[PDB]
Design a protein around this nucleic acid. Structure first.
Length: 68
DNA sequence: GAAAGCCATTAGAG
DNA sequence: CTCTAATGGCTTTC
């Protein structure tokens, strides 16, 4: 596993997860669980992948006005 | 009441 | 050294 041996997040997971993210960064809490089973990850990881994406996405996704 | 939500930082692999 | 994956306190929460 030459990429985050820990946890390689594979394409297929990253496919639909992107599509979800596009619609809804925020999940009402226990929707996260429903994803977690659907893709065979842990609740944790369905926070994290999205959190991680959000964090950067804020800087990236045409955020003028943003103090600074 | 423990959970996502916020975020830079903090391990963590490349 | 670079981008990612994951940690905590504060806040609401159903």
């Amino acid at each position: 596993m030459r990429k985050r041996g820990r946890q390689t997040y594979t394409r297929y997971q990253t496919l639909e997860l992107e599509k979800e993210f596009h619609f809804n960064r925020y999940l009402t809490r226990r929707r996260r669980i429903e994803i977690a089973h659907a893709l065979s990850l842990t609740e944790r990881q369905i926070k994290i992948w999205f959190q991680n994406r959000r964090m950067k996405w804020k800087k990236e996704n045409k955020t003028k006005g943003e103090p600074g």
